Amino acid sequence: RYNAADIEVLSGLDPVKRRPGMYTDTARPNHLAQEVIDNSVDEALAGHAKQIEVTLYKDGSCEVSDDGRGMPVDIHPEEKIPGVELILTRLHAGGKFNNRNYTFSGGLHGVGVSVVNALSTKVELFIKREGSEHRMEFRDGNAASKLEVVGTVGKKNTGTRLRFWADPKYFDTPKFNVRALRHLLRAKAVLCPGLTVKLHDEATGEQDSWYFENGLRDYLKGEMAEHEMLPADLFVGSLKKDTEIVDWAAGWVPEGELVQESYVNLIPTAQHGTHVNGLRSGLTDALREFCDFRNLLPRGVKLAPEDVWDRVTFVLSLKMTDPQFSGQTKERLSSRQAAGFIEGAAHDAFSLYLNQNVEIGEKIAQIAIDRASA
Amino acid sequence: RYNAADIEVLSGLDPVKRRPGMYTDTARPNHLAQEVIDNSVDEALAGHAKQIEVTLYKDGSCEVSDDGRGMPVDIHPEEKIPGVELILTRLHAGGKFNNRNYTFSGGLHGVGVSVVNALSTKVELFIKREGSEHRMEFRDGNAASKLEVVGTVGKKNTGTRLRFWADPKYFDTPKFNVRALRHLLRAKAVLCPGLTVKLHDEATGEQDSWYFENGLRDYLKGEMAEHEMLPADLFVGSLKKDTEIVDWAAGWVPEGELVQESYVNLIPTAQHGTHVNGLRSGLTDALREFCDFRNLLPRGVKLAPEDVWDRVTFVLSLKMTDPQFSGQTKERLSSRQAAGFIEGAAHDAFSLYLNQNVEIGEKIAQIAIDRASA
Ligand SMILES: Nc1ncnc2c1ncn2[C@@H]1O[C@H](COP(=O)(O)OP(=O)(O)NP(=O)(O)O)[C@@H](O)[C@H]1O
Ligand SMILES: Nc1ncnc2c1ncn2[C@@H]1O[C@H](COP(=O)(O)OP(=O)(O)NP(=O)(O)O)[C@@H](O)[C@H]1O
Ligand SMILES: [Mg+2]
Ligand SMILES: [Mg+2]
């Protein structure tokens, strides 16, 4: 029949092994690498790392090296294991449930690295802290070694280096999408100024290396260099509040295909969420108030946000303490705070731009008016 | 600094309370009710329940009652607490990790009910099993009462009744979307024939009761009675293989707005996924093997899936052992197996309909090819 005994409890990393679809993208191990990139970028965003180096080995493994603080090797006071063993083997264990150890961290669930380990036949990592370099190895998510000291290092030579071999049984294909991972990694250098990011595909000999201090405008200009945007130089804005920061570059294109990237604590949000909603409302408000204060609007036509957005190319990078994502892969942002904050920020900053740059704003407005009439 | 002590381990329901966005749609508590609905529908899908009754009380709470097997009240052999206590209190604990207690269940993660309670100021449930009626109450996710024997019942009166009071701090709005929950509940009666589904919103004066012995074709006809489809009588198909079942009704609409509903073990998948991709592939493949065999397709123009799919209206219901969803909200199905299974079923079944009903099959092709003209 049906009793309490028929209720089974998955513990440790087993929930990830039995249903990985809810913890990662099972199409490719790219998002597993992303999880490791993110923890390195989070160290970078906290002013502790200045270099992320990603290597795609010919044996299918991927490795991420940062010069951040290194994940703790110390013994957990109420968990009996060294921190790294705890981090790699337990769900909902992480340093980012507060805003003490990381301010604007991409990681929030304490699940990321553990998913990598749970879905990797092998994980080998080297941590450098307190003058000593350590090594720990895992197999099929289980601890495969002890906390080894492999060498001595300079006191301030710190960092985490993690290399994982994705188990092909959990994925439609074990092959990495290099173009996507290349694009992803460069944007991390654009969005975290001062961070040097390198990628090395040992299968093709590719090397790439990025460093940008103030490059959001030039980043989006470069991604649509073939197309004619207006303003030709890409309206950019910003707003800081030490709990929320927003940066964006936006343009309107009469012809061609649209770059539309959005980010939350440097994590890409493919289905965009609420922060993109605020940018649309704010830009729309500033544009329907510019069409009316100047009577650019034929009569009978009213601008819907859809008309504003149909031909926009934007790059939105929001940073906030405690975002709210809909899943571990973090594809849309559902924080309701974000919609208003960006709408206001963009509404003020675009209104000033238009009343300062009247002829350009008209040419913007005509693109929206042409979409609404249609 | 930053040592192992700074790594926090959230246990119990604490992960849900600190980051509810990854476990539910925090825009409104609708998805909390869905989790309770889903567990009742799974009892129905296992041939043990024949009526689910949903009541949206004016005090903001929701209650879902089924006449199924009732969730276990005995003590778990290795967890020491009664089954209901384990179900409500622990993550990744369920009877749906195998195909023993439920064959085609919507639930797969063992997390659903725990999320509802974890995000509710109060939860009160009644179970009917073993001739005795039990009751247990929760507050803020914690057990607030014991497993009380509140009454006696007949041997064959069995069932589960759960009432939860969603904590308003976790949600953008505490009011339920009745239109959405109304539409949802009707699909459960349509997709599980013989199941009687009742909705009672005590605030809207609304009462509803759904029962269909065969309603898939009639369901889509009613939702697109406002537009003229082709075939006017709605091409439908089906296929069973003792591991997966697929049912669908599909039509092509020259004018009006397209209803496109997809389901996996009766759980709605709004961002459809692989089951819809296979249906699109099968129907498109079958239509060119018809446009080319009957030479209705101009050459130099080719039929792509987008052209077939541009104006399709479908309702697709897949049932399979071990689906794979991308998140707790189960918005996309990523099982790549399902894509092929439906493609074959749809490809064979659509080829037959066209070759028998060609004057209709032609007018279908005209919609697809004209759409390709652009
Ligand atoms: N490169 C690193 N350097 C230092 N600490 C790290 C590093 N990578 C991971 N950590 C620690 O590992 C813990 C858990 O990481 P992880 O499993 O990725 O979950 P999370 O990053 O905290 N949040 P999420 O990724 O959304 O599940 C964090 O609390 C960090 O303190
Ligand atoms: N109405 C019910 N009748 C009988 N058993 C139930 C009922 N509701 C819940 N259960 C049991 O409680 C377990 C946990 O349910 P739940 O937390 O909703 O997750 P799940 O159904 O296992 N899968 P998921 O919904 O994706 O998390 C189920 O596996 C059932 O065994
Ligand atoms: Mg992380
Ligand atoms: Mg469930």
Tab-separated table of C-alpha atoms in Angstrom, chain B:
chain	number	residue	atom	x	y	z
B	1	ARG	CA	37.809	37.925	7.978
B	2	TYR	CA	36.641	34.777	6.538
B	3	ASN	CA	37.024	31.301	7.922
B	4	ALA	CA	34.917	28.163	8.139
B	5	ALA	CA	32.755	29.666	10.901
B	6	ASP	CA	31.599	32.261	8.347
B	7	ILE	CA	30.105	29.411	6.282
B	8	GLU	CA	26.521	29.059	7.467
B	9	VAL	CA	24.520	25.859	7.008
B	10	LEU	CA	20.782	26.383	6.636
B	11	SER	CA	18.763	23.328	7.677
B	12	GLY	CA	15.122	22.378	8.001
B	13	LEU	CA	12.997	24.841	6.046
B	14	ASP	CA	15.441	27.735	6.550
B	15	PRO	CA	16.641	27.774	2.886
B	16	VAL	CA	13.045	28.388	1.768
B	17	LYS	CA	12.491	31.251	4.213
B	18	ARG	CA	15.742	33.046	3.362
B	19	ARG	CA	15.481	32.725	-0.452
B	20	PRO	CA	11.875	31.844	-1.342
B	21	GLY	CA	12.318	33.073	-4.914
B	22	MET	CA	13.997	29.829	-5.947
B	23	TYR	CA	11.172	27.666	-4.541
B	24	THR	CA	8.042	29.547	-5.639
B	25	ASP	CA	6.667	32.454	-7.637
B	26	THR	CA	6.712	35.201	-5.007
B	27	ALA	CA	4.555	37.543	-7.103
B	28	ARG	CA	1.414	36.026	-5.557
B	29	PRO	CA	0.657	32.910	-3.464
B	30	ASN	CA	-0.982	31.145	-6.423
B	31	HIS	CA	1.954	28.756	-6.841
B	32	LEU	CA	1.701	27.813	-3.165
B	33	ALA	CA	-1.828	26.566	-3.829
B	34	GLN	CA	-0.591	24.804	-6.984
B	35	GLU	CA	1.818	22.686	-4.928
B	36	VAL	CA	-1.120	21.504	-2.824
B	37	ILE	CA	-3.309	21.040	-5.918
B	38	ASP	CA	-0.554	19.022	-7.596
B	39	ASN	CA	-0.235	16.579	-4.697
B	40	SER	CA	-3.992	15.992	-4.827
B	41	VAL	CA	-4.023	15.548	-8.617
B	42	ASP	CA	-1.218	12.993	-8.244
B	43	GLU	CA	-3.450	10.979	-5.917
B	44	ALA	CA	-6.114	11.266	-8.624
B	45	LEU	CA	-3.673	10.267	-11.381
B	46	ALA	CA	-2.895	7.147	-9.311
B	47	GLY	CA	-6.578	6.149	-9.324
B	48	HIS	CA	-7.237	6.842	-5.637
B	49	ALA	CA	-8.921	10.273	-5.640
B	50	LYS	CA	-12.056	11.369	-7.489
B	51	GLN	CA	-12.642	14.916	-6.223
B	52	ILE	CA	-10.435	17.891	-5.333
B	53	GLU	CA	-12.123	20.862	-3.641
B	54	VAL	CA	-10.337	24.227	-3.510
B	55	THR	CA	-11.684	27.017	-1.307
B	56	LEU	CA	-10.189	30.515	-1.324
B	57	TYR	CA	-11.340	31.967	1.969
B	58	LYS	CA	-11.945	35.678	2.442
B	59	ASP	CA	-9.261	35.773	5.163
B	60	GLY	CA	-6.616	35.207	2.462
B	61	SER	CA	-6.108	31.504	3.213
B	62	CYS	CA	-6.603	28.610	0.790
B	63	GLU	CA	-7.656	25.018	1.450
B	64	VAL	CA	-7.406	21.924	-0.762
B	65	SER	CA	-9.200	18.668	0.074
B	66	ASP	CA	-9.027	15.333	-1.752
B	67	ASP	CA	-10.551	11.905	-1.159
B	68	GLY	CA	-7.277	10.123	-1.919
B	69	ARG	CA	-5.206	7.761	0.175
B	70	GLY	CA	-4.391	10.461	2.756
B	71	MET	CA	-0.821	11.301	3.602
B	72	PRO	CA	0.785	8.781	5.983
B	73	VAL	CA	0.242	9.284	9.705
B	74	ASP	CA	2.465	6.515	10.980
B	75	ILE	CA	6.091	7.135	12.261
B	76	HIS	CA	8.858	7.000	9.644
B	77	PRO	CA	11.160	4.016	10.345
B	78	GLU	CA	14.436	6.031	9.962
B	79	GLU	CA	13.247	9.600	10.640
B	80	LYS	CA	11.234	8.924	13.884
B	81	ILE	CA	8.436	11.463	13.243
B	82	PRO	CA	4.970	10.795	11.706
B	83	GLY	CA	4.811	10.825	7.929
B	84	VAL	CA	2.810	14.050	7.752
B	85	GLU	CA	5.350	15.745	10.036
B	86	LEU	CA	8.188	14.607	7.774
B	87	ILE	CA	6.305	15.652	4.611
B	88	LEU	CA	5.582	19.164	5.870
B	89	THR	CA	8.929	19.807	7.573
B	90	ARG	CA	11.756	18.333	5.484
B	91	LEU	CA	13.043	19.213	2.032
B	92	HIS	CA	13.565	16.438	-0.525
B	93	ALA	CA	11.229	13.990	1.227
B	94	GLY	CA	8.523	12.374	-0.866
B	95	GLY	CA	7.008	9.243	-2.325
B	96	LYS	CA	7.716	10.362	-5.901
B	97	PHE	CA	11.429	9.599	-6.291
B	98	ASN	CA	10.374	6.244	-7.803
B	99	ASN	CA	7.342	4.965	-9.738
B	100	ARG	CA	6.141	2.763	-6.841
B	101	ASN	CA	3.507	4.838	-4.994
B	102	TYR	CA	2.637	7.126	-7.935
B	103	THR	CA	3.253	6.200	-11.556
B	104	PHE	CA	2.605	9.474	-13.433
B	105	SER	CA	2.980	12.176	-10.780
B	106	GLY	CA	3.398	15.903	-11.262
B	107	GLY	CA	5.521	16.070	-8.123
B	108	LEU	CA	9.133	14.962	-8.383
B	109	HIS	CA	11.388	17.007	-6.053
B	110	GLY	CA	9.840	16.237	-2.653
B	111	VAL	CA	9.808	19.954	-1.866
B	112	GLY	CA	6.332	21.262	-2.762
B	113	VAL	CA	4.307	21.000	0.452
B	114	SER	CA	7.342	22.039	2.512
B	115	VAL	CA	7.568	25.283	0.512
B	116	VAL	CA	3.880	26.068	1.091
B	117	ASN	CA	4.209	25.635	4.863
B	118	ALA	CA	7.654	27.241	5.135
B	119	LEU	CA	6.162	30.413	3.638
B	120	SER	CA	2.908	30.357	5.642
B	121	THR	CA	2.243	31.905	9.046
B	122	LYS	CA	-0.187	29.029	9.701
B	123	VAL	CA	-0.913	25.622	8.153
B	124	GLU	CA	-3.686	23.278	9.330
B	125	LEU	CA	-4.320	19.830	7.833
B	126	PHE	CA	-6.738	16.919	8.287
B	127	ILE	CA	-5.920	13.375	7.185
B	128	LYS	CA	-8.412	10.498	6.967
B	129	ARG	CA	-6.745	7.076	7.182
B	130	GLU	CA	-7.273	3.781	9.031
B	131	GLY	CA	-10.754	4.575	10.314
B	132	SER	CA	-9.434	7.436	12.458
B	133	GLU	CA	-9.212	11.123	11.554
B	134	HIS	CA	-5.983	12.953	12.392
B	135	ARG	CA	-5.169	16.663	12.589
B	136	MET	CA	-1.929	18.643	12.802
B	137	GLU	CA	-1.184	22.383	12.825
B	138	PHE	CA	1.977	24.343	11.955
B	139	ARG	CA	3.076	27.913	12.657
B	140	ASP	CA	5.739	29.667	10.550
B	141	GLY	CA	6.693	26.247	9.239
B	142	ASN	CA	7.352	24.785	12.692
B	143	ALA	CA	5.175	22.049	14.163
B	144	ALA	CA	2.619	23.819	16.348
B	145	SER	CA	0.570	20.849	17.535
B	146	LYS	CA	0.804	17.097	17.741
B	147	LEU	CA	-0.789	14.461	15.538
B	148	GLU	CA	-4.167	14.481	17.226
B	149	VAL	CA	-6.893	11.903	16.724
B	150	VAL	CA	-9.897	14.205	16.362
B	151	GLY	CA	-12.577	11.780	15.161
B	152	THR	CA	-13.624	8.394	13.845
B	153	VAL	CA	-14.426	7.646	10.204
B	154	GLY	CA	-15.495	4.755	7.993
B	155	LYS	CA	-12.850	2.426	6.581
B	156	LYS	CA	-13.253	3.755	3.035
B	157	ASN	CA	-13.539	7.416	3.790
B	158	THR	CA	-9.900	8.418	3.167
B	159	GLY	CA	-8.393	11.711	2.085
B	160	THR	CA	-6.191	14.728	2.677
B	161	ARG	CA	-7.295	18.261	3.564
B	162	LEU	CA	-4.727	21.064	3.892
B	163	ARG	CA	-5.372	24.733	4.692
B	164	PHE	CA	-2.540	27.269	4.675
B	165	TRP	CA	-2.230	30.964	5.564
B	166	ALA	CA	0.427	32.465	3.297
B	167	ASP	CA	2.782	34.835	5.120
B	168	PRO	CA	2.285	38.221	3.389
B	169	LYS	CA	5.935	39.264	3.826
B	170	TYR	CA	7.164	36.741	1.223
B	171	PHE	CA	4.845	37.830	-1.610
B	172	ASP	CA	4.486	40.884	-3.851
B	173	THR	CA	0.720	40.669	-3.215
B	174	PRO	CA	-1.213	38.341	-0.879
B	175	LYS	CA	-4.363	38.167	-3.064
B	176	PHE	CA	-4.855	35.087	-5.228
B	177	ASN	CA	-5.379	35.438	-8.978
B	178	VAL	CA	-8.754	33.738	-9.243
B	179	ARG	CA	-8.896	33.935	-13.047
B	180	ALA	CA	-5.590	32.053	-13.221
B	181	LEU	CA	-6.508	29.508	-10.544
B	182	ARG	CA	-9.940	29.041	-12.120
B	183	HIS	CA	-8.430	28.275	-15.527
B	184	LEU	CA	-5.869	25.965	-13.907
B	185	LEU	CA	-8.403	23.903	-11.962
B	186	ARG	CA	-10.572	23.271	-15.029
B	187	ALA	CA	-7.581	21.797	-16.870
B	188	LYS	CA	-7.089	19.279	-14.050
B	189	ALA	CA	-10.630	18.001	-14.593
B	190	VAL	CA	-10.181	18.094	-18.377
B	191	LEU	CA	-6.858	16.234	-18.311
B	192	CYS	CA	-7.837	13.682	-15.612
B	193	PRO	CA	-11.255	12.416	-16.771
B	194	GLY	CA	-13.643	11.375	-14.033
B	195	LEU	CA	-12.038	13.806	-11.584
B	196	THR	CA	-14.443	16.331	-10.071
B	197	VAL	CA	-12.756	19.655	-9.295
B	198	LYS	CA	-14.442	22.335	-7.193
B	199	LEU	CA	-13.459	25.952	-6.624
B	200	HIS	CA	-15.157	28.265	-4.131
B	201	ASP	CA	-13.854	31.802	-3.749
B	202	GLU	CA	-15.742	32.969	-0.669
B	203	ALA	CA	-14.773	36.555	-1.518
B	204	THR	CA	-16.115	36.584	-5.092
B	205	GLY	CA	-19.284	34.681	-4.375
B	206	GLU	CA	-17.979	32.421	-7.163
B	207	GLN	CA	-18.606	28.688	-7.142
B	208	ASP	CA	-17.245	26.266	-9.723
B	209	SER	CA	-17.420	22.523	-10.283
B	210	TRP	CA	-15.707	20.747	-13.168
B	211	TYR	CA	-16.143	17.224	-14.506
B	212	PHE	CA	-15.454	15.981	-18.033
B	213	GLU	CA	-15.574	12.394	-19.220
B	214	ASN	CA	-13.854	13.471	-22.450
B	215	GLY	CA	-13.049	17.120	-22.793
B	216	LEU	CA	-9.748	17.771	-24.595
B	217	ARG	CA	-11.174	18.481	-28.058
B	218	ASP	CA	-14.151	20.306	-26.537
B	219	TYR	CA	-11.812	22.237	-24.204
B	220	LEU	CA	-9.760	23.820	-26.988
B	221	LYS	CA	-12.841	24.397	-29.136
B	222	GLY	CA	-14.404	26.438	-26.339
B	223	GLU	CA	-11.283	28.529	-25.691
B	224	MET	CA	-10.975	29.202	-29.454
B	225	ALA	CA	-14.686	29.398	-30.232
B	226	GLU	CA	-13.954	33.134	-30.561
B	227	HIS	CA	-11.862	32.543	-33.733
B	228	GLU	CA	-12.206	30.186	-36.679
B	229	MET	CA	-9.758	27.287	-36.624
B	230	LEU	CA	-8.791	24.867	-39.331
B	231	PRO	CA	-9.560	21.987	-39.205
B	232	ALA	CA	-12.831	23.410	-37.901
B	233	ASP	CA	-13.143	20.213	-35.828
B	234	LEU	CA	-9.665	20.248	-34.272
B	235	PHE	CA	-7.124	17.558	-35.277
B	236	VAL	CA	-6.382	15.437	-32.153
B	237	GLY	CA	-3.966	12.558	-31.474
B	238	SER	CA	-2.747	10.171	-28.753
B	239	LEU	CA	-0.062	7.518	-28.053
B	240	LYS	CA	0.789	5.224	-25.076
B	241	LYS	CA	3.972	3.249	-24.396
B	242	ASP	CA	3.698	2.170	-20.666
B	243	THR	CA	6.258	4.881	-19.806
B	244	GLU	CA	4.853	7.968	-21.565
B	245	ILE	CA	1.439	9.055	-22.834
B	246	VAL	CA	0.779	12.056	-25.085
B	247	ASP	CA	-2.518	13.744	-25.966
B	248	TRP	CA	-3.077	16.871	-28.022
B	249	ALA	CA	-5.591	18.933	-29.955
B	250	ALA	CA	-4.190	21.279	-32.595
B	251	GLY	CA	-5.590	23.784	-35.067
B	252	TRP	CA	-4.511	26.625	-37.327
B	253	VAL	CA	-6.088	30.058	-36.944
B	254	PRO	CA	-5.923	32.695	-39.715
B	255	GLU	CA	-7.231	35.439	-37.392
B	256	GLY	CA	-7.346	35.992	-33.675
B	257	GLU	CA	-5.289	35.151	-30.699
B	258	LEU	CA	-3.717	31.753	-30.149
B	259	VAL	CA	-4.302	29.545	-27.108
B	260	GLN	CA	-1.146	27.426	-26.553
B	261	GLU	CA	-1.326	25.271	-23.404
B	262	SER	CA	1.120	22.480	-22.537
B	263	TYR	CA	1.194	20.067	-19.603
B	264	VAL	CA	3.458	17.380	-18.114
B	265	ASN	CA	1.815	14.954	-15.676
B	266	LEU	CA	-0.951	17.592	-15.516
B	267	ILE	CA	1.418	20.345	-14.285
B	268	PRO	CA	1.259	23.423	-16.565
B	269	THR	CA	4.539	24.342	-18.282
B	270	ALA	CA	4.193	27.981	-19.311
B	271	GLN	CA	7.599	28.204	-21.068
B	272	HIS	CA	6.771	25.059	-22.830
B	273	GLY	CA	9.940	23.028	-23.435
B	274	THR	CA	10.876	19.820	-25.201
B	275	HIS	CA	7.436	18.200	-25.300
B	276	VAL	CA	6.096	21.130	-27.339
B	277	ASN	CA	9.251	21.193	-29.477
B	278	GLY	CA	8.672	17.580	-30.497
B	279	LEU	CA	5.013	18.236	-31.293
B	280	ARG	CA	6.068	21.167	-33.475
B	281	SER	CA	8.706	19.053	-35.244
B	282	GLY	CA	6.294	16.186	-35.904
B	283	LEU	CA	3.504	18.413	-37.214
B	284	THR	CA	5.887	20.439	-39.400
B	285	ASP	CA	7.677	17.366	-40.775
B	286	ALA	CA	4.291	15.834	-41.595
B	287	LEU	CA	3.065	18.974	-43.385
B	288	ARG	CA	5.957	19.225	-45.863
B	289	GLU	CA	5.702	15.507	-46.623
B	290	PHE	CA	2.225	16.660	-47.636
B	291	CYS	CA	3.054	20.000	-49.309
B	292	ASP	CA	5.777	18.352	-51.390
B	293	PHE	CA	3.893	15.146	-52.216
B	294	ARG	CA	0.981	17.190	-53.400
B	295	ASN	CA	3.279	19.996	-54.730
B	296	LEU	CA	1.462	22.755	-52.979
B	297	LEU	CA	4.668	24.456	-51.872
B	298	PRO	CA	6.307	26.965	-54.229
B	299	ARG	CA	9.938	26.074	-54.720
B	300	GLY	CA	12.642	28.367	-53.458
B	301	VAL	CA	10.350	28.800	-50.458
B	302	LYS	CA	10.666	26.053	-47.833
B	303	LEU	CA	8.511	25.276	-44.821
B	304	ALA	CA	10.287	25.961	-41.535
B	305	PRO	CA	8.768	25.039	-38.153
B	306	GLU	CA	8.124	28.723	-37.366
B	307	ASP	CA	5.851	28.974	-40.420
B	308	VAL	CA	3.736	25.989	-39.339
B	309	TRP	CA	3.816	27.140	-35.721
B	310	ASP	CA	3.154	30.813	-36.403
B	311	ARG	CA	-0.617	30.493	-35.965
B	312	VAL	CA	-1.108	27.105	-34.251
B	313	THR	CA	-3.468	26.646	-31.314
B	314	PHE	CA	-2.780	23.530	-29.258
B	315	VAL	CA	-3.397	21.919	-25.887
B	316	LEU	CA	-0.715	19.286	-25.242
B	317	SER	CA	-0.758	16.807	-22.334
B	318	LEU	CA	2.310	14.605	-21.810
B	319	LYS	CA	2.476	12.003	-19.028
B	320	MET	CA	5.770	10.269	-18.314
B	321	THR	CA	7.694	8.501	-15.597
B	322	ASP	CA	10.586	10.708	-14.468
B	323	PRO	CA	10.194	14.081	-16.204
B	324	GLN	CA	12.830	16.782	-15.783
B	325	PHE	CA	11.758	20.352	-15.029
B	326	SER	CA	14.023	23.392	-14.830
B	327	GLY	CA	12.711	24.656	-11.483
B	328	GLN	CA	10.250	24.171	-8.664
B	329	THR	CA	7.631	26.188	-10.551
B	330	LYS	CA	7.985	23.693	-13.437
B	331	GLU	CA	7.710	26.209	-16.265
B	332	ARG	CA	9.815	24.377	-18.881
B	333	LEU	CA	10.281	20.650	-19.502
B	334	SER	CA	13.879	19.834	-20.446
B	335	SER	CA	13.616	16.049	-20.876
B	336	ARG	CA	15.114	15.461	-24.316
B	337	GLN	CA	13.499	12.026	-24.453
B	338	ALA	CA	10.016	13.595	-24.554
B	339	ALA	CA	10.913	15.615	-27.662
B	340	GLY	CA	11.431	12.524	-29.798
B	341	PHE	CA	8.489	10.601	-28.339
B	342	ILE	CA	5.949	13.289	-29.240
B	343	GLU	CA	7.580	14.013	-32.611
B	344	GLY	CA	6.962	10.454	-33.773
B	345	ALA	CA	3.428	10.335	-32.378
B	346	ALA	CA	2.543	13.693	-33.934
B	347	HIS	CA	4.339	12.999	-37.226
B	348	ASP	CA	2.540	9.713	-37.904
B	349	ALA	CA	-0.863	10.882	-36.663
B	350	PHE	CA	-0.768	14.174	-38.590
B	351	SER	CA	0.243	12.498	-41.855
B	352	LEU	CA	-2.867	10.301	-41.684
B	353	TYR	CA	-5.256	13.186	-40.999
B	354	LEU	CA	-3.960	15.127	-43.997
B	355	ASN	CA	-4.126	12.172	-46.419
B	356	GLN	CA	-7.781	11.470	-45.484
B	357	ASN	CA	-9.068	15.075	-45.215
B	358	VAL	CA	-7.119	16.761	-47.877
B	359	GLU	CA	-9.300	19.709	-48.715
B	360	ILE	CA	-8.845	20.663	-45.057
B	361	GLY	CA	-5.212	19.616	-45.071
B	362	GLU	CA	-4.685	21.958	-47.960
B	363	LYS	CA	-6.195	24.997	-46.334
B	364	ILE	CA	-3.873	24.230	-43.406
B	365	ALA	CA	-0.878	24.268	-45.748
B	366	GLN	CA	-2.007	27.590	-47.180
B	367	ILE	CA	-1.748	29.122	-43.712
B	368	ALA	CA	1.742	27.678	-43.271
B	369	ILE	CA	3.058	28.567	-46.737
B	370	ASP	CA	1.592	32.062	-46.938
B	371	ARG	CA	3.248	32.686	-43.598
B	372	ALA	CA	6.546	31.601	-45.156
B	373	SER	CA	5.953	33.966	-48.113
B	374	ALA	CA	6.916	36.808	-45.771
